[PDB]
Amino acid sequence: KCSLTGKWTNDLGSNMTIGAVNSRGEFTGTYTTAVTATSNEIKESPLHGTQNTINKRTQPTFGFTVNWKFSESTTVFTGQCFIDRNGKEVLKTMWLLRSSVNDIGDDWKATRVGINIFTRL
Amino acid sequence: KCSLTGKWTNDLGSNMTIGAVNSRGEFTGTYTTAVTATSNEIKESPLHGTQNTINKRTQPTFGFTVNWKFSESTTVFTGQCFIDRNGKEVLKTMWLLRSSVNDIGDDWKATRVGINIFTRL
Amino acid sequence: KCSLTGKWTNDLGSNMTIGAVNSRGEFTGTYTTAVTATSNEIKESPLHGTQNTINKRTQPTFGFTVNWKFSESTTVFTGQCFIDRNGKEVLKTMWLLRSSVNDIGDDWKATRVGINIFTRL
Amino acid sequence: KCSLTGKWTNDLGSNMTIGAVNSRGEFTGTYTTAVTATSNEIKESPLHGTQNTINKRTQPTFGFTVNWKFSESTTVFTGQCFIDRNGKEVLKTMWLLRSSVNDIGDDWKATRVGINIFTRL
Ligand SMILES: C[C@@H]1NC(=O)N[C@@H]1CCCCCC(=O)c1ccc2ccc3cccc4ccc1c2c34
Ligand SMILES: C[C@@H]1NC(=O)N[C@@H]1CCCCCC(=O)c1ccc2ccc3cccc4ccc1c2c34
Ligand SMILES: *[C@@H]1O[C@H](CO)[C@@H](O)[C@H](O)[C@H]1NC(C)=O
Ligand SMILES: *[C@@H]1O[C@H](CO)[C@@H](O)[C@H](O)[C@H]1NC(C)=O
Ligand SMILES: *[C@@H]1O[C@H](CO)[C@@H](O)[C@H](O)[C@H]1NC(C)=O
Ligand SMILES: *[C@@H]1O[C@H](CO)[C@@H](O)[C@H](O)[C@H]1NC(C)=O
């Protein structure tokens, strides 16, 4: 019932487009963040992920990686597709944003965490 | 070159194998977890990710999704490949483990967080 | 301007009451969660925290621990008090919920993560 | 068996001293981080927390807030006191570091996450 393919926007105004989900739960897309910590121009960035198919849930868990094109960083998102009380779909996700550090001693400070809620455009 | 390709084990005893990293930073592999939250007999599970290639860092950031084959869950990992003080490679990662819940009202409890350190086998 | 003292509710329906913040940034209160992971019954539970006072910010960062009275668990929250575009106050927080485990080998699964948004009652 | 009172060091070299745990599980102490991202001199900073006393566990969960004296930030830690195979105590903790941001629109980027392991000094 709750399918990742298509166009989504989040609570921060960011957009993503996810393509077809193949029989193995794999998908690809693009991500346009509306926000950045960096002082660079934001670029559309590719994403790759999977959606869990065990017991063929109508509201499956999923995960994807966003490989940013304007920074040395990587973000991963994980969450679940729900059908809220109206029949409306909603992705409830959490993410980790990993920055690059030069030295292994700075590893401790390299990872940020937050949430995003996506709905269809 | 701190390279993701090859065989890795973590501090919990889990194993992963990552294949070739193509010119777009994409890779695939398999994951055998040594631990679970789940009711089930553990199965080798596929993973898909990307390694960031901006400025071609010798210690790049990366992310990957593990699409578990014995549970309704998904885990995402993100981190960075370092060359420690010996010349040994080490992946420092953090993860988010998303469980499935039946009801959107239980979403709050569905996400666990932790770390793992990988070294070569 | 944005003061922790008083009564707050969150997006999950939980309530908290925070007493006076002394000259060291310390405060105490109580927390009544509207949600829990088990069927044991919920009890009002104490909280203890501090609010950062460096540069006496009108929107300071803060942290508090909730010492649950119906579980072996502990939750910590950290966040910042903002004055949104209207003059309304809002606490943006993240939390870590640590469960007890009885073997150190299960430590990996003991920590959950999420967010909460509080506004005044 | 596993008591928070005393002097502890972590895997990054940071030290903390925790005072008596009163009958309500409350404790106070001081934290000297060995690392910082800020361009300031590190200062000893106060901590306030609680240890969970439900069922009087010999290895309880706990939480504490560190009110930093050289930045506008706050850190919270949560974890559990274990007695390792040898009768060694160990604190396994996770933390959230909340930075101050000027604008609520930057909230998303204000929270970092990690772990620490403490042992007695
Ligand atoms: C921070 C969130 N926002 C809010 O407003 N409230 C939320 C916190 C939930 C309240 C914690 C008590 C709890 O869920 C538990 C209550 C009771 C439990 C009993 C056994 C348990 C075993 C293993 C893990 C457990 C985790 C949690 C248990 C529990 C566990
Ligand atoms: C919890 C960890 N384990 C320990 O033993 N000590 C660690 C805590 C570090 C001390 C916090 C002060 C700090 O470095 C910061 C304090 C304040 C900050 C404000 C803005 C920031 C933006 C980007 C990166 C930042 C990094 C660090 C910032 C900071 C940052
Ligand atoms: C998101 O999509 C909407 C509608 O397609 C568009 O108007 C908006 O500008 C997009 N936002 C970003 C950040 O690209
Ligand atoms: C990981 O590989 C090691 C060494 O090859 C092996 O002994 C171990 O059983 C593997 N772990 C799992 C969980 O299969
Ligand atoms: C919090 O306060 C509101 C309004 O006073 C009340 O209706 C609600 O049930 C309270 N929630 C809990 C969990 O006590
Ligand atoms: C921690 O304590 C040890 C032993 O007393 C000391 O040698 C070390 O410098 C301390 N570290 C910090 C950051 O204060």
Residue numbers in the entry:
A (entry chain B), B (entry chain A), C (entry chain C), D (entry chain D): 3 to 123
What does the paper say about this structure?
Interestingly, initial screens for the second complex (avidin/D9P) produced crystals in several crystallization conditions. The crystals belong to the orthorhombic space group P212121, with the unit-cell parameters a = 57.16, b = 81.95, and c = 107.89 for avidin/B9P and a = 58.97, b = 81.52, and c = 107.78 for avidin/D9P. The final models of the avidin/B9P and avidin/D9P complexes were refined to resolutions of 2.0 Å and 2.1 Å, respectively. The B9P molecule consists of the ureido ring, tetrahydrothiophene ring, valeric acid, and the pyrene moiety, while D9P molecule includes the methyl group and methylene bridge instead of the tetrahydrothiophene ring. The binding cavity in each subunit of avidin is occupied by a single ligand molecule with the same orientation, with the ring system of biotin and desthiobiotin moieties hidden deeply inside the β-barrel, while the pyrene moiety is located at the barrel entrance. In both avidin–pyrene conjugate complexes, well-defined electron density allowed for the determination of the position of B9P and D9P in monomer C, but the pyrene moieties of D9P are not equally well visible in the electron density maps in all monomers that form the avidin tetramer. Photo-degradation of the pyrene ring is most likely observed in two monomers in the avidin/D9P complex, and only part of the ligand was included in the final model. This degradation is more effective for the monomer where the β-barrel opening site is exposed to the solvent channels. For molecules involved in more extensive crystal contacts, less degradation was observed. The sulfur atom from the tetrahydrothiophene ring of B9P acts as an acceptor for the hydroxyl group of Thr77, while in the case of D9P there is no equivalent interaction.
Egg-white avidin, similarly to streptavidin from the bacterium Streptomyces avidinii, is a small, tetrameric protein which belongs to the calycin superfamily. The interaction between avidin and biotin, its natural ligand, is one of the strongest non-covalent interactions known in biology (dissociation constant of ~10−15 M) and has been extensively characterized for more than three decades. The structural motif of this protein consists of an eight-stranded antiparallel β-barrel surrounded by flexible loops. In the present work, we have determined the first crystal structures of the avidin complexes with two fluorescent pyrene-biotin conjugates: 1-biotinylpyrene (B9P) and 1-desthiobiotinylpyrene (D9P), which were obtained via a Friedel–Crafts acylation of pyrene with biotin or desthiobiotin, respectively.
